[PDB]
Every structure is written in C-alpha cells, then in structure tokens.
Design a protein around this ligand. Structure first.
Ligand SMILES: COc1ccc2c(ccc[n+]2C(=O)c2ccc(S(N)(=O)=O)cc2)c1
Ligand SMILES: [Zn+2]
Length: 259
C-alpha cells in the first residue's frame, strides 16, 4: 500500500494520480491577496456557539491529529457569516511545519504562518458528515493562523496529551476540552469557496479564514513536531510539513468581512 502522504514520493504533487480533482476548479488552500480581496458589507458577523461543545477523543491518523466532538446534537455550531443554515463541529486539527517559517496552508500575501488550525463543521440540512462532503455547501471550515511568540494557555491541554498518541493509529480519551480557548479576539475573516485540503480533495467547503492569528509558544509547536507519521514499531518519520501548498485561485473571489 503506497498511499498518499507528504513525502517526496507521495506528497501533494502526486495526489492527482489517485484523486484527479486535485487539478480542479475550486481547490484549497489558496494565497489570500489582501489588496484584491473585496470588503463585502452584505456579509454577517460569524456566529460561533461553542458553549455546549463535547469533545470525546483525540486521534493520530498518520497525517495530523484530530480532536473529535460529539455531533449527534446541535451543541457546537457555526452560522452567520457567509453561511446559510447551521453547521455542526465534528473535529479540529492542525497543519504545521518543520520550522516556524512554514506550516500554514493558506497564505496571506505569500506570507506563511508557523501552523494553521482547522475547525471542521458540516451542514445539518444533509443529516450526516458523509452526505455533506458530497455537496458544494456541505462543510464550513474555520481556519485560524498560528504564529510563534507567547504561549496559548487554551492549547496546552492538547499539547500535553500528544505523548500518548505518538504514532499512527493511536487514540486517547479527550473529554471536556473547550475550543473557545483556541480563538483569537477578533472574528474578522476572509471567505471563498474551496475544498478539503487532503484527499479525497472534495470540492465541498466554504472556507472562513480569520485575519487575526493566535500566538503559541516555541515549546508548544515543538511538541507538535515530536509526533510521528508512521505506526508504532516502524522507522521514525517525524510528523512535520503536513500542509498542502497554495493552489490556483482560477475563477473565484475572496471576500473580506472587514474594511
Ligand atoms: C473514514 O472517515 C473519514 C475521515 C476523514 C475524512 C473523511 C471524509 C472526507 C475528508 N475527511 C475529513 O474529515 C477532512 C479532511 C480535510 C479537512 S481540511 N484540512 O479541513 O480541509 C477536513 C476534514 C472520512
Ligand atoms: Zn486541515
């Protein structure tokens, strides 16, 4: 099984062979050109209601780690912004680099952040996640940039469990994590229509990318980089540089919620 990954032989420029939509019309991520993105006064404020969020578990899937939520009721929800309807939080994960100068998927005027957080939500009108990903308005992913400087106290709970899920296929109980602790002050955002940034690369995402990055410490991101792509008792490949680069914008407009 020579499966997709991020190395020289199985990384982003190889994905099209198995997933031809990789060269499609609405692929993510993209470079966000701040001078070309237009203020859209019709865009609403983003409504992030995470007060009843229920985390269940954390998993290393060999590509990143996913913190999963119970999405069997309208607990943690995203709405307003560019969205019509209600989208439920299912999981969050991050993408990061081998060094602080790279790691984000989206870029801002070609600037790369040290990492990027993705909070993944599905449109409740489609009833389940698997059905949502087959729809052009099926998912809403909230993207949040990470830069290195001061520690984020709301992240440390995640950092401290990574020891227990070092390799691919390991999981641990991860209850009562509050993702409000990962949010920046301002909910100003850019939005555009896009895709999942890993295979199957489905073109089903309304991207909402926050302008304000959060700060995490060097020590926090260092612990991300101690994870492993490989499974237990296999040769060690550190989980670093699990980001797809910017893809062509083609026939698409990036709108800003702010002036
Ligand atoms: C077998 O069960 C699974 C597991 C993961 C699946 C998935 C269906 C599509 C993509 N994924 C995702 O959940 C996924 C992949 C990428 C992104 S991203 N990085 O936010 O665009 C979000 C979500 C099914
Ligand atoms: Zn992602």
């Amino acid at each position: 099984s020579h499966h997709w990954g991020y190395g020289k032989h199985n990384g982003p420029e190889h994905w099209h062979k198995d997933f031809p939509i990789a060269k499609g019309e609405r692929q993510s991520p993209v470079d966000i050109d701040t001078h070309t993105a237009k203020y859209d006064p019709s865009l609403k404020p983003l409504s992030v209601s995470y007060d009843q969020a229920t985390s269940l578990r954390i998993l290393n899937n060999g590509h990143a780690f996913n913190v999963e939520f119970d999405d069997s009721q309208d607990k943690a929800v995203l709405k307003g912004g560019p969205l019509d309807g209600t989208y439920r939080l299912i999981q969050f994960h991050f993408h990061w680099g081998s060094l602080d100068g790279q790691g984000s998927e989206h870029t801002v005027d070609k600037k790369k952040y040290a990492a990027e957080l993705h909070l993944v939500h599905w449109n409740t009108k489609y009833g389940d996640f698997g059905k949502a990903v087959q729809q052009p308005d099926g998912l809403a992913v909230l993207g949040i940039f990470l830069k290195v400087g001061s520690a984020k106290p709301g992240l440390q709970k995640v950092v401290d469990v990574l020891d227990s899920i070092k390799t691919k296929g390991k999981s641990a109980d991860f209850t009562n994590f509050d993702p409000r602790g990962l949010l920046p002050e301002s909910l100003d955002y850019w939005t555009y229509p896009g895709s999942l940034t890993t295979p199957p690369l489905l073109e089903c995402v309304t991207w909402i990318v926050l302008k304000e990055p959060i700060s995490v410490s060097s020590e926090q991101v260092l612990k991300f980089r101690k994870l492993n792509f490989n499974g237990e008792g296999e040769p060690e490949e550190l989980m670093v540089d699990n980001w797809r680069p910017a893809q062509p914008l083609k026939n698409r407009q990036i709108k800003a919620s702010f002036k």
